[PDB]
Amino acid sequence: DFPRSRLRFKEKLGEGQFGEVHLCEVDSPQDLVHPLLVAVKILRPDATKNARNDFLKEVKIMSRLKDPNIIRLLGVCVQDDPLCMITDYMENGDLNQFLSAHQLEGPTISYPMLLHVAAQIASGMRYLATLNFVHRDLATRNCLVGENFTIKIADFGMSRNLYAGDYYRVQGRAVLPIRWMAWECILMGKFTTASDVWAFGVTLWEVLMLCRAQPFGQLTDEQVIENAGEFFRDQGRQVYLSRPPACPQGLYELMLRCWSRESEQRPPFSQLHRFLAEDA
Numbered sequence: 001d002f003p004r005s006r007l008r009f010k011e012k013l014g015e016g017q018f019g020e021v022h023l024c025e026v027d028s029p030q031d032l033v034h035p036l037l038v039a040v041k042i043l044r045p046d047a048t049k050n051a052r053n054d055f056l057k058e059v060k061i062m063s064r065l066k067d068p069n070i071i072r073l074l075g076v077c078v079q080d081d082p083l084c085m086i087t088d089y090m091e092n093g094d095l096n097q098f099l100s101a102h103q104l105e106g107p108t109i110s111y112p113m114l115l116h117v118a119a120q121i122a123s124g125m126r127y128l129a130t131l132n133f134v135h136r137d138l139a140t141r142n143c144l145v146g147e148n149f150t151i152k153i154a155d156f157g158m159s160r161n162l163y164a165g166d167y168y169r170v171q172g173r174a175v176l177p178i179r180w181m182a183w184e185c186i187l188m189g190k191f192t193t194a195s196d197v198w199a200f201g202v203t204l205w206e207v208l209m210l211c212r213a214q215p216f217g218q219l220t221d222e223q224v225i226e227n228a229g230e231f232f233r234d235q236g237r238q239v240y241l242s243r244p245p246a247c248p249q250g251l252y253e254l255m256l257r258c259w260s261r262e263s264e265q266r267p268p269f270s271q272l273h274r275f276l277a278e279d280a
């Protein structure tokens, strides 16, 4: 596994129950593939067996995820306690905070740069599909920003209090990000690659809004659940996210295709990348 002796503390990026996150420095990297900045999630020596089990299930998943636009697992420290996972560290935080702090061309962001960010997301989602892996929680909050506008798709679960509003419970049953979920996810619980395309659609709406508003921000969580019912009903009472001001009708009709009632009609990520890379 990874030598703990090679991890040099810099900052405590945060804490929670059963663990805490650290930013560390690694000299002369001859373990991975001038010191390298790494992100370390460490399990508390007080953590429950349920907490230990969840950590090793998460390590198992991440170990297969190897793509330039997906968060890499550099290593683990599982042989002894406390258990830890080492990922790449993305200096500019998540895409939501990154976009929220910028204005369109407080630094600026250009329309081609917005599309370039949305292109990395599609190319990344394309990879997970080739592995037949459903993300289940794609949104800007779950996208990390690095040097030279690089985007790497991550998943924080429901660990950050900042995004508590993006999740609807449903107890007790299942805490869900309904505002990003397709109609079939809400009514049936049928998560697929085709429903990830719907989430991608909503994510591209977020990017073109520059993370300024929450999807269906004027409607209640119950009203959004009601709206999934109208897509199944197909009588013309179904509603959609409005066109962002800085969005041409062209790119808007793309978002609309991610919102086709039939999952077969929704375009795949290979097609979504190619359009975001060619048409502007």
Ligand SMILES: C[C@H]1CN(c2cncnc2)Cc2cc(NC(=O)c3cc(CN4CCN(C)CC4)cc(C(F)(F)F)c3)ccc21
Residues within 6 Å of the ligand: 013, 021, 039, 040, 041, 057, 058, 061, 062, 065, 070, 071, 085, 086, 087, 088, 089, 090, 091, 093, 135, 144, 153, 154, 155, 156, 157, 158
């Ligand atoms: C080190 C620490 C801090 N870190 C950081 C902080 N600041 C700047 N840079 C980096 C980011 C980070 C991220 C993770 N986990 C992932 O990235 C993730 C995990 C899975 C599978 N789990 C989903 C959640 N579920 C509850 C359990 C299963 C899916 C996917 C993918 F499929 F989307 F790729 C990626 C773990 C630790 C850390």
